[model samples]
Target: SCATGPRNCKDLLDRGYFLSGWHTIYLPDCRPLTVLCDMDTDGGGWTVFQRRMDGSVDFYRDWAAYKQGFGSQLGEFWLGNDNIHALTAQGSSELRTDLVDFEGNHQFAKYKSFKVADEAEKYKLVLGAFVGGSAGNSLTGHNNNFFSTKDQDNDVSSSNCAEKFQGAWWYADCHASNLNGLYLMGPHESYANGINWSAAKGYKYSYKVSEMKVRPA
Candidate 1:
């Protein structure tokens, strides 16, 4: 069953459904299948489906409802507020939990019980660079090396900048609109692998990483 309208969504539990997994398995063989999670920030609310109603997983209304619900949190489900649906389309698994937004409003503060493992384990974050807006007279270069110690010390003349950016500066500065698109790349055995252009201090910059994706290798 799909949770689209408020009525349908509310009745999801009555249909003997748990928010975790829906009709994702076959009866005899019990083979696993994948489902799509529709989570929107505006209105319709989140929905998880083991199989699409029409087989395409392209139901617009349900998708809209899911997008609305999944983007943020709604009080409909007994689940906690501010929950986001984490889905792996490839694996056909969906988990709904309240997780902190990487670039949301509460960057600086400590995230106590938030699902850091969920964010790190579930998805692959694609990292690259792009150029946007108008630049004045200054040269705007998107430093892909912002996360690197050598680059930070060489350019900013501060060994602490990289650490600060990852440890504190990111939380202090990241916002939903402009700075939010930046994604942290990798946390290697030794160091963090990536950081986005979180801020512009002195001058205008050139291209930047407008899009990112993450997946299992």
Candidate 2:
């Protein structure tokens, strides 16, 4: 069944869904993929959500943060008001493709219902899955990213002064906005020091969305 209201890590645990280790997040549009979960957190959370094909989880700050997190492993993943109906539609097998081409990206035009709401709720769900265990206190160092229709300059140097600056920096940053839908991109990364973090971004990626389901022991 599709969840009607907002949900958090604790909510998923109470329902008997355990994400202790690796589990598959199944999406209707793309293939089922493996993600690592860390149940040892305060009440349980996703430690390594959405493992990428090349086995690298990338991190990005600023407006690209959200998409970078959700898109990690997958090329793009979207959740917003416009397609909320299609995403929450139960048992619908329609094809939802990506508006921009980024190679190996596939999304369902129709998706099985899941728990999600406004922008805040969407961020909670995604951030919960992306940064599990710590829950609410996990916002340090992680920057705010956005979803938009047009692509920003991909070649922008990470060395740029603005990129080096953290904490609400990206919130004021300007980038094209895709008002029609919200998308997530790949390069899912586990917490690491700055050097290794930068190195992890050198791989190609893909992504998908699915109901958070229990993994067989």
Number of the predicted model whose lDDT against the real structure is largest: 2
lDDT of 2 by residue, 116-190 (tens): 233443332212222222111222222234222122322223433233221111111321211111123443342
Where does model 2 exceed 4 Å of error? 1-19, 28-31, 47-217
Each model's TM-score, in the order given? 0.19, 0.28
For model 1 the local lDDT of residue 128 reads: 24
Worst 10 residues of 2 by lDDT: 92-101
* Total clashing pairs in model 1: 26
lDDT of 1 by residue, 1-217 (tens): 1223222221333454444332232211233322222322112122432111111211112212322222212211111111122322222221221212223211111111111112222211112222232211111222212211212222233344334333211121221122211133222232222222223211121112221111111
Residue 160 shift from truth in candidate 2, angstroms: 6.4
Report each candidate's C-alpha RMSD, comma-separated, in the order given: 17.0, 14.0
After superposing all C-alphas onto the true structure, candidate 1 shows an RMSD in angstroms of: 17.0
Name the regions of candidate 1 deviating beyond 4 angstroms: 1-40, 43-86, 89-124, 127-162, 166-217
- TM-score, prediction 2: 0.28
